Each structure stands twice: as C-alpha cells, then as structure tokens.
Amino acid sequence: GPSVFLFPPKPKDTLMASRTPEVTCVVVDVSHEDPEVKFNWYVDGVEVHNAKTKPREEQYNSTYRVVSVLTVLHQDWLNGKEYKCKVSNKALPAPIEKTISKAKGQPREPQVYTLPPSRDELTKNQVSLTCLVKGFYPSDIAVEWESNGQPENNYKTTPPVLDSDGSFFLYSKLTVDKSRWQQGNVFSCSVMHEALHNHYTQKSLSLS
Amino acid sequence: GPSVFLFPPKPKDTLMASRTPEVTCVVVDVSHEDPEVKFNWYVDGVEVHNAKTKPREEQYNSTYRVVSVLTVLHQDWLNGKEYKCKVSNKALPAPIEKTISKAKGQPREPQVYTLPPSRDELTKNQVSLTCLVKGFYPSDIAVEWESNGQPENNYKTTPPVLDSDGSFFLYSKLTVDKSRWQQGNVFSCSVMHEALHNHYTQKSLSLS
Ligand SMILES: *[C@@H]1O[C@H](CO[C@@H]2O[C@@H](C)[C@@H](O)[C@@H](O)[C@@H]2O)[C@@H](O[C@@H]2O[C@H](CO)[C@@H](O[C@@H]3O[C@H](CO[C@H]4O[C@H](CO)[C@@H](O)[C@H](O)[C@@H]4O[C@@H]4O[C@H](CO)[C@@H](O)[C@H](O)[C@H]4NC(C)=O)[C@@H](O)[C@H](O[C@H]4O[C@H](CO)[C@@H](O)[C@H](O)[C@@H]4O[C@@H]4O[C@H](CO)[C@@H](O)[C@H](O)[C@H]4NC(C)=O)[C@@H]3O)[C@H](O)[C@H]2NC(C)=O)[C@H](O)[C@H]1NC(C)=O
Ligand SMILES: *[C@@H]1O[C@H](CO[C@@H]2O[C@@H](C)[C@@H](O)[C@@H](O)[C@@H]2O)[C@@H](O[C@@H]2O[C@H](CO)[C@@H](O[C@@H]3O[C@H](CO[C@H]4O[C@H](CO)[C@@H](O)[C@H](O)[C@@H]4O[C@@H]4O[C@H](CO)[C@@H](O)[C@H](O)[C@H]4NC(C)=O)[C@@H](O)[C@H](O[C@H]4O[C@H](CO)[C@@H](O)[C@H](O)[C@@H]4O[C@@H]4O[C@H](CO)[C@@H](O)[C@H](O)[C@H]4NC(C)=O)[C@@H]3O)[C@H](O)[C@H]2NC(C)=O)[C@H](O)[C@H]1NC(C)=O
C-alpha cells in the first residue's frame, strides 16, 4: 500500500543565522479508496505540533502524494535530535514510523583548496576554476562561488564522495570567460560545514 | 506485485577490445505464492536467446530476486540497439516490458585536464592529484589513474554531473604521499569515452 519517505533539511539552513530549516515527510502511493492521511510529529520521542501538512495534490499514476513539513531548530538538528514522523492511513494494517537525524559519527573539518585552470584550457573562450573540499564528515555541506561580494551563476558542484578514509570530498567547478581570469579578478569558494569555525570559510583564487 | 529494473553495461566493457559487456534484468518483489518467473530477451524487437538467468536467491524481506544477464555486442550497444527484456509472472495481470539503450543525443568528446595540488596541501603527509574531464556526452565514462604503466589504488572519482551546456563533467582525485610527488614521478589520467579516438586518451601530470 502506502510507502513513506523522509528528508533532511538543507545544509545551508542548519548552518547560517536566521534561516528556517525543515524536515519533510512525503507519503506516496495512496489510492482513491483510502486517501485520508494523518501525521504525527515527534521530536526525540516527545510529540510536537508546529507542523505544516500540505493539502494532497493528485498524481500521474492515480495516487495521492501528501507532504507534511516540520520546522526544526538549527541547533536541535546539530545536536542530534531524532525526528520521527508517524503516518496514518486505513490502507496500512499499522501506521508507518520513519525516523531521521543528522549523520552520527565523528565530525571532521573540511579542507578547502583552490585550483587554477590547467594550462591547456587557456585557449578556450571560457576556463574552469576549481574548488576542492576534502576531509569532511558528515557529508552535509554547502559550497558556493562569488566575486566582489556578489554571487556567481555559472558554477556546478559534485555530490559528496566517500573517500578511502571514510570522510567525504567534492569539487566545485566555476566556469568564467578567459578574459575575466586573465584580467586578474578575484574569485572565492565559500564553504559551509558544521566543523568549520562559525560554520563558514572562504578561500580565494586569482592570477600570479 | 513484481517490479522490474534494467541496467546498462559498464562503460569500460563497451569501449575496450575483447571485453564482455552485459545488460542485466533484475526482478524484485515476488512472493512465495507466485515465484515462478520467466524472461524474454529482444534485441531491437528481434528476439534473442543467449541469456543467462541466475537461479533465484531469496531475500531479507521474504521476496525473490531473479537476475537474468544478456551478453551484448560492444558495437551493438554503441550503435543504439534497444534491449527490451520481457518478464512473466502470475502475480502480474500482464507481463512487464522494460527497454534500455545508450543515451540518445549528440555525442561530444571529453576534454581532459590535469591539476597539480594547491600550494596549501603541500604540508600534509599526502597530496591530491586532480583530473578534470569535461564537455562529454553521453555520460557513460571510465576514468583511471596509473603510474609507470601500472594502475593506482588510492584514487576516487566523482559521478558525472550535468553542466550548464547539457554536457557532463567529473573529477578524479588521486591521493599520493607528498614525497612521491616531490620526487618528480609521472602520473596519468586515463580516460575512456566513445567520442575519443580509439575510445582512449591519457594526460600526464608531474612537477615543473
Ligand atoms: C506514482 O508517481 C510517483 C511520483 O514520482 C514520479 O512522478 C511522475 C510525474 C514521473 O516523474 C515518474 O518518474 C514518477 O512516477 C512515484 O513516487 C515515487 O516513489 C518512489 C519510491 O518507489 C520514490 O523514490 C525515492 O526517491 C527518494 C528521493 O526522492 C527525492 O529525490 C527524487 C529525485 O531523485 C525526487 O523525485 C523526490 O521528489 C525527492 O525529492 C526531494 O524532495 C524533498 C521535498 O521536501 C526536497 O527537500 C529534496 O531536495 C528533494 N530532492 C531532489 C530535488 O531530488 C530516495 O531516497 C528513495 O531511495 C531509497 O529507497 C528506495 C526504495 O524505494 C531504494 O530503492 C533506494 O536504494 C533508497 O534506499 C534508501 O537508502 C537510504 C540510505 O541511503 C535509507 O535510509 C532508506 O531507508 C532506503 N529506502 C528504503 C529501501 O526504504 C526512493 O528511490 C520517489 O520519491 C517518488 N517520487 C516522488 C516525486 O515523490 C510512484 O512511484 C508512482 N507510483 C508507482 C508507479 O508505484
Ligand atoms: C525487499 O528487498 C529488496 C532488496 O533490497 C534490500 O533488502 C531490503 C530489505 C532493504 O534493506 C534494501 O535496502 C536492500 O538493498 C528491495 O528491492 C529494491 O527495490 C527498489 C525499488 O523500490 C530498487 O531500487 C532501485 O534501485 C535502482 C538502482 O539499483 C542499483 O543500485 C542500488 C544502489 O544504488 C542497488 O541497491 C541495486 O542492487 C542496484 O545495483 C546495481 O546492480 C547492477 C546488477 O547488474 C549493477 O550492474 C550495478 O552496478 C548496480 N548499481 C549500483 C549503484 O550498485 C534505481 O535506479 C531505481 O530508481 C528508479 O526507480 C525508483 C523507484 O523505486 C525511483 O524512485 C527512481 O527515481 C528511479 O526511477 C527511475 O528513473 C529512471 C531515470 O532516473 C528511469 O529511467 C526509470 O524508468 C525509473 N524507474 C522506473 C522503472 O520507474 C530504484 O531506486 C532496488 O533495486 C531493490 N534492491 C535491490 C538490492 O535490488 C525491496 O524494496 C524490498 N521489498 C519491499 C518493497 O519492501
């Protein structure tokens, strides 16, 4: 019958002042026969009620997808609180309890390195600027590129990868026109991770 | 009832001489009531019979997982042949036909760049060597590191990422002891992709 999924808040929401992080409970596969759903949000076993149950949009396979949203505390998430969402629907012989929390296991500070474009790329219209971030745990992270205190459009970041030591790494590639690089502009890789000081660090990258 | 999945061959198998690439049909969720499964392998509609149906290992949720394996031609896969695997089981009102093939869409040759370690890492026991591969389509690829004609252990590669242009990129990080790099050894990033000459290319990386 019904299958339930459960989602962590975004890394940036748990790390930066005054954002509103959110655990999300998504129930999928309820028919027209038993579509009346109901949630119960518990924070470390203790029941709480500041939840947001979105009304039930239909589907493209004739089921219903109900989404409840539970605002959490940035610090409640960082201190390892469990968030179990209890689901009710007659199509189930018994309610579904799915629980979620931050990755357990020793945290490790990311190491942030910048890499200038390989001398071979320097004959294309655009060039690639590279951020290596490595050594971090848990894998929850946010990486961003800017320049002169303003963000960047044309960058892409790889998912976190398990490294040989059991920590994570990733790369961010920032693509800019060759000229902007030749001209000597300054670009920054901003990283957000819990094991950083103030959850934030920044390494620059420019010509030499 | 039964849900069926379908898997492409490994990128290296379709690109290098004399390997044996394989499409794999994995049926999941069959009970003890209707566990008698049956396959039918078609190559571009035309039925074929050089298939390998593994006998049905049980599970940890009391279902059966049946796996048939179909050897394909390296060139039949590169020329866009469709491989539909037809599945039969009484728990289904009708057989399940899942079809699979190489990514359609114009292929693009990867551009392979090597990046030496950031001058900041040069105070750790080990250093990171970096291979950027970019501009390729379809995302099916194989990247490997070696040194003096022999492979490397301690390297990790990111999944292919969709770039802003609709092509893919990735990075491969090779971790070596600092000394091995200081000493001036030569390391190579080998790339395999269909849009390369002979499906293979290699860029080196050493000290200056
Ligand atoms: C009827 O249709 C619906 C709708 O889906 C689609 O809708 C139509 C329009 C088409 O597009 C169709 O393609 C399709 O029908 C179907 O509902 C789907 O049901 C499947 C389950 O079979 C669910 O798959 C799961 O996906 C989650 C992750 O999903 C996130 O990312 C998806 C994209 O990759 C995205 O589609 C989802 O919306 C969701 O997106 C996130 O949403 C939140 C919202 O708050 C957001 O904050 C996030 O940022 C956002 N992320 C983004 C943007 O992508 C995945 O985790 C599940 O994988 C686990 O479970 C699988 C078992 O089903 C198992 O195979 C995997 O290996 C994996 O295993 C898990 O492993 C972890 C540890 O790593 C463990 O903790 C877990 O317990 C374990 N799971 C197990 C085994 O229990 C899973 O693959 C889809 O979410 C869902 N689609 C949507 C959009 O809701 C439905 O199937 C159709 N009916 C039928 C035919 O049956
Ligand atoms: C009973 O148990 C079985 C076995 O699970 C095991 O035991 C249970 C108890 C749990 O503890 C599990 O955690 C444990 O693993 C369960 O069977 C599972 O069923 C789910 C579906 O609900 C399947 O999930 C799918 O996973 C595929 C890819 O799976 C590969 O990689 C997995 C790890 O990443 C690995 O677990 C799989 O074995 C498989 O491994 C591959 O194997 C081949 C063999 O040749 C090998 O070559 C590969 O190298 C290897 N790969 C890796 C990485 O190791 C995933 O693609 C599926 O996602 C699609 O479907 C989802 C719906 O569930 C949906 O959410 C996704 O969006 C996605 O939808 C697809 O989207 C694509 C485009 O992106 C589109 O083209 C497709 O059409 C569309 N799919 C369709 C058809 O709609 C999916 O998540 C697991 O394969 C399967 N587990 C195993 C081990 O087979 C079962 O759930 C249990 N019973 C129940 C119901 O409770």
From Swiss-Prot, chains A, B:
PTM field: Glycosylation on Asn-61 is required for interaction with Fc receptors and ability to activate the complement pathway.
A GO-annotated cellular component: extracellular exosome
Annotated stretches, region: CH2: 1-104
Start and end residues of each Ig-like domain: 2-101, 110-206
Record region (CH3): 105-208
A GO term for molecular function: antigen binding
Effect annotated for changing G1A: Reduces the affinity for FCGR1A about 40-fold. Abolishes binding to FCGR2A and FCGR3A. Impairs ADCC of virus-infected cells by monocytes. Decreases binding to complement component C1q. Decreases complement-dependent cytotoxicity
Annotated keywords: Adaptive immunity, Cell membrane, Chromosomal rearrangement, Disulfide bond, Glycoprotein, Immunity, Immunoglobulin, Immunoglobulin domain, Membrane, Secreted, Transmembrane, Transmembrane helix
Disulphide bonds in the chain: C25-C85, C131-C189
Residues bearing carbohydrate: N61
Signal peptide positions (record): none
Gene Ontology biological process terms in this record: adaptive immune response; antibacterial humoral response; antibody-dependent cellular cytotoxicity; B cell receptor signaling pathway; complement activation, classical pathway; complement-dependent cytotoxicity
Summary of the function given for this chain in its UniProt record: Constant region of immunoglobulin heavy chains. Immunoglobulins, also known as antibodies, are membrane-bound or secreted glycoproteins produced by B lymphocytes. In the recognition phase of humoral immunity, the membrane-bound immunoglobulins serve as receptors which, upon binding of a specific antigen, trigger the clonal expansion and differentiation of B lymphocytes into immunoglobulins-secreting plasma cells. Secreted immunoglobulins mediate the effector phase of humoral immunity, which results in the elimination of bound antigens.
Quaternary state and interactors: Immunoglobulins are composed of two identical heavy chains and two identical light chains; disulfide-linked. Interacts with FCGR1A; this interaction mediates IgG effector functions on monocytes. Interacts with FCGR2A and FCGR3A.
Pathological condition linked to this protein in its record: Multiple myeloma: A malignant tumor of plasma cells usually arising in the bone marrow and characterized by diffuse involvement of the skeletal system, hyperglobulinemia, Bence-Jones proteinuria and anemia. Complications of multiple myeloma are bone pain, hypercalcemia, renal failure and spinal cord compression. The aberrant antibodies that are produced lead to impaired humoral immunity and patients have a high prevalence of infection. Amyloidosis may develop in some patients.
Protein name: Immunoglobulin heavy constant gamma 1
Organism: Homo sapiens
